Amino acid sequence: VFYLHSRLLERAAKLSSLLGEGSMTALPIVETQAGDVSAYIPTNVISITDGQIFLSADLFNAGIRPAINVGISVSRVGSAAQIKAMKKVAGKLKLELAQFAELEAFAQFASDLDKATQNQLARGQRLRELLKQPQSAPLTVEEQVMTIYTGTNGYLDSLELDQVRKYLVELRTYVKTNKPEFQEIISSTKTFTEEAEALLKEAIQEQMERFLLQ
Amino acid sequence: VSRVGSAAQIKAMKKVAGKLKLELAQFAELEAFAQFASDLDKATQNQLARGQRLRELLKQPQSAPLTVEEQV
Amino acid sequence: MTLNLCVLTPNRSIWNSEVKEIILSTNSGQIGVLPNHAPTATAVDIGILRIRLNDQWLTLALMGGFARIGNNEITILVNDAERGSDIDPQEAQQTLEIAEANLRKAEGKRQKIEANLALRRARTRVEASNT
Amino acid sequence: LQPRIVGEEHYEIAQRVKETLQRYKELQDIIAILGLDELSEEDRLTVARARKIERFLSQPFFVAEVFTGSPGKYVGLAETIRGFQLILSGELDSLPEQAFYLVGNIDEATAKAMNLEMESKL
Amino acid sequence: GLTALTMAEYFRDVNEQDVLLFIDNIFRFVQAGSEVSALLGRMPSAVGYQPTLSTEMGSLQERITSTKEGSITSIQAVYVPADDLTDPAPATTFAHLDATTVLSRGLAAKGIYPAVDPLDSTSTMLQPRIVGEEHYEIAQRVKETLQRYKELQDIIAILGLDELSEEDRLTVARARKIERFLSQPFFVAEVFTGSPGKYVGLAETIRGFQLILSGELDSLPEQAFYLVGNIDEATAKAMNLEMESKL
Amino acid sequence: LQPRIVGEEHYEIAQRVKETLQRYKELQDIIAILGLDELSEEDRLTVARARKIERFLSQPFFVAEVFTGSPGKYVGLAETIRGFQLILSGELDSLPEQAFYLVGNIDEATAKAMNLEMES
Amino acid sequence: NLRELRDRIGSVKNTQKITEAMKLVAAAKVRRAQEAVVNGRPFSETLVEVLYNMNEQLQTEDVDVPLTKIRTVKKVALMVVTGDRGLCGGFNNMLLKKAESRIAELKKLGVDYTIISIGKKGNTYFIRRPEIPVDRYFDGTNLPTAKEAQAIADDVFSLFVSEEVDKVEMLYTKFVSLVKSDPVIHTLLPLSPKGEICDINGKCVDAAEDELFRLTTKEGKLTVERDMIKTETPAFSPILEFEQDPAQILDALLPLYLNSQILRALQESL
Amino acid sequence: PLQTGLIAIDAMIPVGRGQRELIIGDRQTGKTAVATDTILNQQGQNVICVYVAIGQKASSVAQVVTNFQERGA
Amino acid sequence: PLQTGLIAIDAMIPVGRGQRELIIGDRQTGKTAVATDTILNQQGQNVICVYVAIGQKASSVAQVVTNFQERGA
Ligand SMILES: Nc1ncnc2c1ncn2[C@@H]1O[C@H](COP(=O)(O)OP(=O)(O)OP(=O)(O)O)[C@@H](O)[C@H]1O
Ligand SMILES: Nc1ncnc2c1ncn2[C@@H]1O[C@H](COP(=O)(O)OP(=O)(O)OP(=O)(O)O)[C@@H](O)[C@H]1O
DSSP states (O other): OHHHHHHHHHTOOOOOTTTTOOOOOBOOEEEOSTTOTTSHHHHHHHHHSSEEEEBOHHHHHHTOSSOBOTTTOBOSSGGGGSOHHHHHHHHHHHHHHHHHHHGGGGSTTTTSSOHHHHHHHHHHHHHHHHHOOOTTOOOOHHHHHHHHHHHHHTOOSSSOTTTHHHHHHHHHHHHHHHOTHHHHHHHHHOSOOHHHHHHHHHHHHHHHHHHHHO | OOSSGGGGSOHHHHHHHSSHHHHHHHHHHHHHHTTTSSSOOHHHHHHHHHHHHHHHHTOOOTTOOOOHHHHO | OOOOEEEBOSSSOSEEEOOSEEEEBOSSSBOOBOTTOOSOBBOOOSOOEEEEOSSOBOOBOOSOEEEEOOTTOBEEEESOOOBTTTSOHHHHHHHHHHHHHHHHTOOSHHHHHHHHHHHHHHHHHHHHHOO | OOHHHHOHHHHHHHHHHHHHHHHHHHHHHHHHHHOSTTSOHHHHHHHHHHHHHHHHTOOOOSSTHHHHSSOOOOOOHHHHHHHHHHHHHTTTTTSOGGGGSSOSSSHHHHHHHHHHHHHHHO | OHHHHHHHHHHHHTTOOEEEEOOTTHHHHHHHHHHHHHHHTOOOOSTTOOTTHHHHHHHHHSSOSOOSSOEEEEOOOOOOGGGOSSSHHHHHHHHHOOEEOOBOHHHHHHTOSSOBOTTTOEESSOOHHHHOHHHHHHHHHHHHHHHHHHHHHHHHHHHOTTTSOHHHHHHHHHHHHHHHHTOOOOSSSTTTSOOOOOOOOHHHHHHHHHHHHTTSSTTSOGGGGTTOSSHHHHHHHHHHHHHHHHO | OOHHHHOHHHHHHHHHHHHHHHHHHHHHHHHHHSOGGGSOHHHHHHHHHHHHHHHHTOOOOSTTHHHHOSOOOOOOHHHHHHHHHHHHHTGGGGSOSTTTTTOSSHHHHHHHHHHHHHOO | OHHHHHHHHHHHHHHHHHHHHHHHHHHHHHHHHHHHHHHHHHHHHHHHHHHHHHHHHSTTSSOOOTTTOOOOOSEEEEEEEOOSSSOSTTHHHHHHHHHHHHHHHHTTTSSEEEEEEESSHHHHHHHHTTOOOBSOOBOOSSIIIIIHHHHHHHHHHHHHHTTTEEEEEEEEOOOSSSSOOOOEEEEEESOOSSSOOBOGGGOSBOTTTOOEEEEEEOSSSEEEEEEOOOOOOOOOOTTOOBSSOHHHHHHHHHHHHHHHHHHHHHHHHO | OOOOSOHHHHHHSOOOTTOBEEEEESTTSSHHHHHHHHHHHTTTTTOOOOOOOOSOOHHHHHHHHHHHHHHTO | OOOOOOHHHHHHOOOOTTOOOOOOOOSSSSHHHHHHHHHHTTSSSSOOOOOOOSSOOHHHHHHHHHHHHHHTO
């Protein structure tokens, strides 16, 4: 079975320059029974593959959809396969999520923690609201950069824990309609530049004001 | 469990104890869960005491049968 | 000379300013302070403390204590104090009402003495509040 | 259980029910060790509501009469959605949890609360 | 693995060169032998490995020695399945291993490269009668300081670093100095970083930690020990940083 | 262990010892993490009685005298039932635990207790 | 079952995280309590200054005091200060046994013993017990900051003015060391003319034994350290003027000291 | 970069072109959900999607095929 | 007696001649160390010593026999 899976999986890889730079991403699926991820076929596919996107039913019931497990999931390709804008925002995003993952056991005690860890809990709490997505509604890289920037900079501390999703969807639509330079900038350069940073700050505060006047 | 239910009793024992198994299981919960709470409200405390009386009732010695009149 | 106002509750310093004109009551009755008010030691009753820096005299209540208005220092040790405008006159009157009602229920002796004290402390609250 | 198929109200109420039960189960062992007093207002609140919801998802069955003793109740989808909306919003947030046990509708649960309230007064 | 072994073994049996034999990784060779035995139809041992796990591991782990001619040093990766150190494959591999160096994501995420944790990593070679009493005592004091730092990790944040006693303030200070001096500019990571590669013998190492930990270089900035070769280059960088801080 | 065979007193004291040891076995999971401090008055009572009981069950043997050094005691039913009656009544509640460890009679337990109070 | 074992192990790990975080939370609360008592020191210290100025100026023969007169003990008011929370080791039980011993001693002397239950665990303990005499169950909900101190002050004032419950003694746990602390008994009433806290029978000066403890770390683990800098009052220019007779003025001053002592005791027990 | 359309994946678990990224989960955690999410994201850029169902319901294959039909992918 | 020469064993666990005793423990706890200790402590006593090594590392066996040659034991 290991020979089978190894041949089938390793048939898919990024070809060299002379052969045409063709490629073939294998996105296989294995289902794990009762969280026994160290079973035979799970450990086989985990050994052969590069990355593992681990899905958890306790997050799935808790509302956090897609229910990926961010502390367990890994990808040994890594930021090499990221847009420059995406990696610029993703570094800060990963650090913030690591922090809130450490502070997870301090949310009940949000009454007598120092205000700094209180605010880290607040940011991670909003960031959990950021990452949820509706069913089969995929985003573009530029809209995702919008969302991660709004989150990581600190522009959602004001709105309460639930409105964040509606606020962010309204943000994306307003930017799309009224500042069409951002998506063009990122489509051309694929780099988060200070001009698009200022443009996004402007659009963000505009949408925030009109949404708050609601 | 008993997959026959009240049809394995008589009308008298059914009238006296139709709901008793579900109420006794729910009271096993209520008495098992109210060890965490410090102070209880009076309704729950009285249900807990009655369930404990019920638990003392079901003790039966060896070689002792109870008739249907005594059971009812 | 020009004297300083550092009043203080048991745990902190309620008001640490250096203000001009200060008029607070006492056990004997009513007194006041002008800068360089002579060496004195007065146990202020449960009585409002109007406190006038140059423009404003906003009434700062208190539940009783002891003052020392001597050389360049006016320190008022108070068991509990709460300013005038800070307490709202409506709930202040509400406390006044329920306190008078408890004074009606003052049948016991120690109950009646504590009723008097709680009533008067709740009273000076309202006496500073709505003004 | 998808919005376009079941209606947005049915979907949102299903998601909220699952959320409160999952919060309860993720909290239950921490409570079992620690104690119940030491939880926040919203934590104790959701615990009470989730116990009540766990009661209200019970129902007397038409064929289980020999097992329960009560008569079976057919409960409609509108009645279910309404009752769970109420129990989740906290209208019934003072009724006995046991009033939510083996009841078909939500008016039956209110009437059973009335019966237990009178039984306590006697 | 046997192919790589014999190609290495020539290099020291005939040429008497100090060879390094990297095997990445041992667990997959173990399970490949398990698959071979499975296809051959021989009855399995415990939890699912081949019956000759010990003898098969020996056949590869006993050509790796230091003979009169040369020495093969085997730096092999190991993988623990189901987090077992007691699964037959990890147990048998550890029965052969002599020292383990453990790399942690913490030091990688922070920036102390290489990301070796000096506490999770251990050696059986760090006995006094093998390495010298001076090396042993300096290593012990360094481990004690770093461990006390891990113990104070939560305490200092709440208490404030000033409210600590003088001994514990000294401990956290020297612990930061030590943990930063553990960083090294690599010969092969200069292409990425830009810092020239450096080589530090044990003389430089033991004396550098003696100076840092003995309270003598306790007057240097934290950054003056970071990604530096030895204590001499540490002093050089410290003088640079102080001149750069004056003006 | 049935009254028709062993006498009602023997049977009753055996049931009470089994009861109390069961309750301590239950509370073991709690006390492992918490400690005895967090228990109720009746819970801590049962736990102290169970400690005394599970130590009073111990008896030095004649054939283990080479390992323990202590002369083995022979103690039959007339003293067994009485000693356990006393321990579960709680008259001996003032005694420590080590007084019941490695003794044959409840009298030897009490004498060891008097020694543990002679050594101030 | 493997699922069940993994579940129970995840449960124990959840418990480890919960309790490990509770440890840091309790340390932060200790730090805030320390930061509160150092700020509460000016009130009591300045009042001790002015109060020993009083027995230097009036030379101690001008006193006729409600809160100092000793009417022989006939009914006693023993104040039980108990922590509200739980899982705090045996801090509650230690003083809820000290009170049993102390009452079993003075129960033949002070025929009626009045327990004042300040806290929450005591309010459970005495209602579980068959009704020990309890005047006002003091518990904490926005009270413990200031309203609790003031309410204790009011209760002991009303109880002492009609002099039946004399010899008021409060029970608390001065946190001398972080690991060990035992419930002390300090006679608060009758208040002494000089500012010495009344020990057992009121005969011992406790100004030196009273200490303020602050957090630091002996080489291995964090531990409290006993820290004190205290002197005696100066004259403060006894030419000072009394607005009334110093008898009534000290009668109006003693409620302030009566308040401050109780507030600092409720910080020490906290 | 192969943009999957999920903020979480495209930020924290970056998938590339020629990378064998495994999706692993329990029953009904959304594995096929993330798969269709990616396939439907890749309308814009020029890739060919392949979906190999092994041992699934013909009704489930019918659902996913009809979905791609009404979506345009 | 079989004087093992170790303080703790000779105090608590007296090993006499003709008595089969077990040395059990984790990896790297000192079992071979105490073995070599006891064999070296039979230099005065008349007892000849035997040591077998079932599947031990060749470097370990070489170190053992080298120490025995060094002591002359
Ligand atoms: N990100 C999401 N947001 C909202 N709902 C989701 C999400 N992902 C999945 N769902 C819902 O969860 C249900 C299960 O999804 P899906 O069928 O993709 O899981 P699965 O892992 O393929 O299940 P199985 O393992 O049985 O094949 C779907 O009906 C879908 O409505
Ligand atoms: N009493 C001792 N004093 C100092 N060092 C010791 C002592 N005992 C053992 N050691 C050291 O500990 C290391 C392990 O010792 P030893 O070889 O006896 O363990 P082992 O049980 O044989 O290991 P394994 O179980 O892997 O065979 C050796 O390097 C040895 O130098």
